[PDB]
Design a protein around this ligand. Structure first.
Ligand SMILES: *[C@@H]1O[C@H](CO)[C@@H](O[C@@H]2O[C@H](CO)[C@@H](O[C@@H]3O[C@H](CO[C@H]4O[C@H](CO[C@H]5O[C@H](CO)[C@@H](O)[C@H](O)[C@@H]5O)[C@@H](O)[C@H](O[C@H]5O[C@H](CO)[C@@H](O)[C@H](O)[C@@H]5O)[C@@H]4O)[C@@H](O)[C@H](O[C@H]4O[C@H](CO)[C@@H](O)[C@H](O)[C@@H]4O)[C@@H]3O)[C@H](O)[C@H]2NC(C)=O)[C@H](O)[C@H]1NC(C)=O
Ligand SMILES: *[C@@H]1O[C@H](CO)[C@@H](O[C@@H]2O[C@H](CO)[C@@H](O)[C@H](O)[C@H]2NC(C)=O)[C@H](O)[C@H]1NC(C)=O
Ligand SMILES: *[C@@H]1O[C@H](CO)[C@@H](O)[C@H](O)[C@H]1NC(C)=O
Ligand SMILES: *[C@@H]1O[C@H](CO)[C@@H](O)[C@H](O)[C@H]1NC(C)=O
Length: 710
């Protein structure tokens, strides 16, 4: 129905997006900030948007993007943690310690992450004296029940405003394990990244060898794909969901198994498109064609699952107890009408004889996975339906249909060679070089003087891309060393190739001491790099690799890539910064639209450039601009980060669009110090789309598949 004026709804330090044809909105904040007091607003029948309220229901005059905090532990049994603060800022560290007589499991040291979650696993102090282990208290939750004898239970509770994910109750079972799965508390801003979801789903569905799906000997598997099309998932005849599912089917087929598929879409009533009992339902290619053909057109989930039950049911056939069943539900709402769908899951577990025998519980024979999409999904309800299995995750919440698609594109990219450009798997126990495998450190030794330390990016097995200003003609190759993958070993180089138009010394006679135009160089290594989990290439602009990374058709041009990667907007990008051996991603915004001119003009504030009459003489068409307070407070590069890649993270892949070149002011660590970061604190980076003929030439034997560079 009627629409609401957007006057006055702006959020300080953030933006918003419209949902449900203008009837709702969601606020959007930079990395490390969340919308206060509310994630979403609804358009009211008055023409005004819903009021901004806190928990206690105090009106807030103005919405703001506020620093994320990780929750303080409510309690820690049989030990102490420290430091103890009301709340923790991103990158705060605590540590956990047991009392005498108790032994620590889980993570001793934990760090508050950019997503509002503590790193690692729940710390537990246990004396081994219970029938069951001490189940622990995940940070953010409160536990009721402190006896761990056989058949005792513990219950968990979240704070007002938050929602519990996982088991609200766990029960101590014969053999010494707890039923259900470890809980966590979800705040309104929290989403799972596609990379996290891709690792969590795969490691739930499969066993590790490569990976495999194990069935019974002479054993079967049925997969039920259920799509709630009541809201936006049905948009464009389920186009998004079809992409996801095509990719899922393709991934499952990689494991050599031939499952039977069911396909059901639903809203008020269910539609069965493919039935598991069909002669062709185990033909992956046939099922894929059927799925691609489906179309649209309240949320009756109970009925959708009753369509699933009817596909299952059957006195019973041979090998009924040999089949494992996987339900996959995709939803952006799940506000159920027509009854609680949970009772149907109960009926299913009766049918499959699950939970009916203590000596043979048969939990392996059913898995229900729920993928929630967007800010409007009912979190209690998606969790209620999803399986609860120890050390497994079965409930996901992603931002977007685009992000849901990214989950399955990542899963498809997993088995590809390590040469796959700008792909990073979300290794659970990975370090900094598992998260930025392309990162190179460059050192140059200079007699009686400070050594140069710069950054670069691995672009092929022989090449590291960096800035030219890290080197002069006087630097012999033996003085220059490169390290990759966080290894002590520093690698010998063959040569440094400078862009042929680069000349720091200008322009010096014209009154300009440093001229950074064309500030790019390639280091050719002496020896070929062996790729691995901590050493992998980043994607470069205008190559076949990037077309594929962006999920685009093979006829895609370099102009099409530029349009996708550097449109005339404020572009979300990132660089990697090192602080005390740790690498952290710092999100920045490239001013490539109306703000470009004002970003560029701030160069006059740079030292040496104060007398420059015409700013274009120092800021050339080769340059990209980040920094400043508009639209957002951008972080700035440190001296050590120079030459490093400026990166766009799109479709689960990392594409380097720039090289970190020079900055207006050194203001780096006003970060955790304050700040007082000036509004004219800009960083200038060399745009790689502006030096492609040189790149394509130098890297011509590296098998990168460059497109037309002119
Ligand atoms: C964890 O991280 C948080 C977030 O970074 C951090 O919190 C900061 O803590 C410092 C030190 O305690 C605070 O600094 C104090 O500032 C007091 C003035 O506060 C008002 O003005 C701030 C400045 O506003 C300008 O700039 C900002 C950003 O550039 C811009 O948004 C504004 O428009 C404006 O131009 C403003 O940020 C601040 O707003 C916060 O707090 C209000 C609550 O009133 C809230 O409405 C906002 O949502 C926002 O969160 C506020 O309006 C100043 O009085 C004070 O001076 C004191 O000196 C010492 C203590 O240092 C004392 O003796 C005495 O109290 C003096 O008054 C001091 O300089 C800063 O405000 C915080 N920033 C926040 C909350 O955003 C924590 O320190 C980190 N550490 C941990 C573990 O908590
Ligand atoms: C928790 O962190 C502490 C402090 O950083 C770790 O102890 C240090 O570990 C490093 C790297 O292994 C050593 O170089 C130091 O000798 C240790 N110094 C100390 C005792 O302060 C500790 O290993 C961490 N605990 C874990 C991961 O269990
Ligand atoms: C969905 O496809 C059907 C074809 O059966 C068509 O009627 C309709 O135009 C499509 N809807 C879209 C693309 O929004
Ligand atoms: C399935 O049922 C039959 C008959 O009870 C039995 O012989 C077979 O072993 C069962 N399979 C199991 C235990 O999963």
């Amino acid at each position: 129905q009627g629409s609401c004026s957007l006057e006055g709804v702006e959020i300080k330090g953030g933006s918003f997006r419209l949902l449900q044809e203008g009837q709702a909105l969601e606020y959007v904040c930079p990395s490390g900030f969340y919308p206060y007091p509310v994630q979403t607003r609804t358009c009211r029948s008055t023409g005004s948007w819903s009021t901004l309220k806190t928990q206690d229901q105090k009106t807030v005059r103005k919405a703001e993007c506020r620093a994320i905090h990780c929750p303080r532990p409510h309690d820690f049994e049989n030990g102490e943690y420290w430091p103890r603060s009301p709340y923790y800022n991103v990158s705060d560290e605590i540590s956990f310690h047991c009392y005498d007589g108790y032994t620590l499991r889980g993570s001793a040291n934990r760090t508050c992450q950019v997503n509002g979650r503590w790193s690692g696993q729940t710390a537990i102090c246990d004396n081994g004296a219970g029938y069951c282990s001490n189940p622990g208290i995940p940070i953010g939750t409160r536990k009721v029940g402190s006896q761990y004898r056989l058949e005792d239970s513990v219950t968990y509770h979240c704070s007002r405003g938050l929602t519990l994910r996982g088991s609200q109750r766990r029960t101590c079972q014969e053999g010494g394990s707890w039923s259900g799965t470890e809980p966590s508390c979800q705040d309104s801003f929290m989403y799972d990244t596609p990379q996290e979801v891709a690792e969590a789903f795969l490691s739930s569905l499969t066993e590790t060898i490569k990976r495999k799906i194990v069935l019974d000997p002479s054993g079967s598997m049925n997969i039920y794909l259920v799509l709630d099309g009541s809201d936006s998932i049905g948009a464009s005849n389920f186009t998004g969901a079809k992409k996801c599912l095509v990719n899922l089917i393709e991934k499952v087929a990689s494991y050599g198994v031939k499952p039977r598929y069911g396909l059901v879409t639903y809203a008020t009533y269910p539609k069965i498109w493919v039935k598991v009992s069909e002669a062709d339902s185990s033909n992956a290619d046939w099922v894929t064609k059927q799925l691609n053909e489906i179309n649209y057109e309240g949320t009756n989930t109970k009925k959708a699952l009753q369509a699933v039950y009817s596909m299952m049911s059957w006195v019973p056939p041979e090998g009924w107890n040999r089949t494992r069943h996987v339900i996959i539900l995709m939803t952006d709402g799940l506000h159920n009408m027509g009854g609680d769908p949970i009772t149907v899951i109960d009926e299913i577990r009766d049918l499959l004889y699950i939970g009916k025998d203590r000596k043979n519980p048969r939990e392996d024979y059913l898995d229900v996975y729920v993928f929630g999409v967007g800010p409007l999904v009912n979190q209690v309800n998606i969790n209620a339906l999803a399986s609860k299995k120890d050390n497994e995750q079965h409930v996901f919440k992603v931002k977007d249909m685009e992000n849901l698609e990214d989950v399955f594109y990542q899963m498809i990219d997993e088995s590809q060679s390590l040469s796959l450009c700008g792909m990073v798997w979300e290794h659970r126990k990975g370090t900094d070089y598992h998260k930025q495998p392309w990162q190179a450190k460059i050192s140059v030794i200079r007699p009686s003087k400070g050594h140069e330390s710069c950054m670069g990016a691995v672009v092929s097995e022989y090449f590291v891309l960096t800035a030219a200003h890290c080197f002069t003609v006087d630097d012999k190759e033996h003085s220059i060393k490169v390290s990759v993958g966080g290894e002590k070993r520093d690698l010998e180089i063959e040569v440094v190739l400078f862009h042929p138009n680069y000349n720091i010394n200008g322009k010096k006679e014209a009154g300009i001491p440093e001229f950074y135009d064309y500030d790019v160089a390639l280091i050719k290594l002496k020896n070929k790099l062996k790729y691995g989990q901590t050493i992998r290439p980043i994607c470069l602009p205008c190559t076949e690799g990037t077309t594929r990374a962006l999920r685009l058709p093979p006829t895609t041009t370099c102009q099409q890539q530029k349009e996708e990667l550097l449109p005339a907007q404020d572009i979300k990008a990132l660089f990697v910064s090192e602080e005390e051996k740790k690498l952290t991603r710092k999100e920045v915004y490239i001013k490539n639209g109306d703000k470009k001119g004002s970003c560029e003009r701030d160069a006059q504030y740079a030292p040496g450039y104060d007398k420059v009459k015409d700013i274009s003489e120092v800021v050339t068409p080769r340059f990209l601009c980040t920094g400043g307070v508009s639209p957002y407070a951008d972080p700035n590069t440190c001296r050590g980060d120079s030459g490093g890649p400026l990166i766009v993270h799109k479709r689960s892949r990392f594409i380097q669009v720039g090289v970190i070149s020079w900055g207006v002011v050194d203001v780096c660590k006003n970060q955790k110090r304050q700040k007082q970061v000036p509004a004219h604190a800009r960083d200038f980076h060399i745009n790689l789309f502006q030096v492609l003929p040189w790149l394509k030439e130098k890297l011509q034997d590296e098998d990168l598949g460059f497109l037309a560079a002119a």
